Design brief:
Bound molecules: N-oxalylglycine, manganese (II) ion
CATH superfamily: Cupin
Order of helices and strands: EHEHHEEHEHHEEEEEEEE
Strand content: 25-35%
Structural class: alpha+beta
CATH topology: Jelly Rolls
Shape: globular
Entry title: Human JMJD5 (N308C) in complex with Mn(II), NOG and RCCD1 (139-143) (complex-3)
CATH architecture: Sandwich
PDB class: oxidoreductase
Name: JmjC domain-containing protein 5
Keywords: oxidoreductase, non-heme, iron, 2-oxoglutarate, dioxygenase, jmjc, jmjc domain, Lysine-specific demethylase 8, JmjC domain-containing protein 5, Arginyl C-3 Hydroxylase, jmjd5, KDM8, oxygenase, hypoxia
Distance between the termini: 27 Å
Assembly: monomeric
Number of helices: 6
């Protein structure tokens, strides 16, 4: 079924119905007036960030054998992986861009809902996810709560509860134990038969929308367009 969408719910309703039980939701009317929503174009990103060095993941999925991580300027990333007919999938993923480029922090806000946590605001981690259509983040789980805010473009997102972990066949290794062995959109059901019947939620996340990913909820994300998302990891 589809992740529910709520317009600016109260703090208490979010706490009781979503945060405490660990249920996903999309929040509307919250980030739709970030200055980023109107300001961030490729040209703006080049002007403010183009000369800075960023880590880039190259390859279809980080679970692939040919996948690698490199460094280049934001201008180079845009030129090679976005505008010119790219040879490979590149993704400026999981990067603390706002600590590197404080000017861009002026264009975003931490959602007020994160104050319902038991952690310090100073310890919230903010990451950029910027890439072309077709980037894929394989199914995995994270150790904090997350607000994933969509700024540019759309993402297809699949969510599996931590109760379903058995049917997701986590990797055995220590580096990949938070990651499923299954390719969500083309699962090998001969090797991973339990996956087929496992229930899930899905959504297309559009600009101005916030997805709440409860701590340890398994998530899979594919960009449908040129995309820019901002995540907030909080407790
Ligand atoms: O946006 C993506 O491709 C993947 N995002 C995340 O895994 C996250 O925000 O924790
Ligand atoms: Mn994640």
């Amino acid at each position: 079924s589809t992740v529910p969408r709520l317009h600016r719910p109260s703090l208490q309703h979010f706490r009781e119905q979503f945060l405490v039980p660990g249920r996903p939701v999309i929040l509307k009317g919250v980030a739709d007036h970030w200055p980023a929503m109107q300001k961030w174009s490729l040209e703006y990103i080049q002007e403010i960030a183009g000369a800075r060095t960023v880590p880039v993941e190259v390859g279809s999925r980080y679970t692939d054998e040919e996948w690698s991580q490199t460094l280049m300027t934001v201008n180079e990333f845009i030129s090679k992986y976005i505008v010119n007919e790219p040879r490979d999938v590149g993704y400026l993923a999981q990067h603390q861009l706002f600590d590197q480029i404080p000017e861009l922090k002026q264009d975003i806000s931490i959602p007020d809902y994160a104050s319902l946590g038991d952690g310090e605001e100073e310890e919230i981690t903010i990451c950029a996810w910027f890439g072309p259509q077709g980037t894929i983040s394989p199914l995995h789980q994270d150790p904090q709560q997350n607000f994933l805010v969509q700024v540019m473009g759309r993402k297809y997102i699949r969510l599996y509860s931590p109760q379903e972990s058995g049917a997701l066949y986590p990797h055995d290794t220590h580096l990949l134990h938070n990651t499923s062995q299954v390719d969500v959109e083309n699962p090998d059901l001969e090797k991973f038969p339990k996956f087929a019947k496992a229930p899930f939620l899905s959504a297309i996340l559009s600009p101005g929308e916030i997805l709440f990913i409860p701590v340890k909820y398994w998530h899979y994300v594919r960009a449908l367009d040129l995309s820019f998302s901002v995540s907030f990891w909080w407790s």
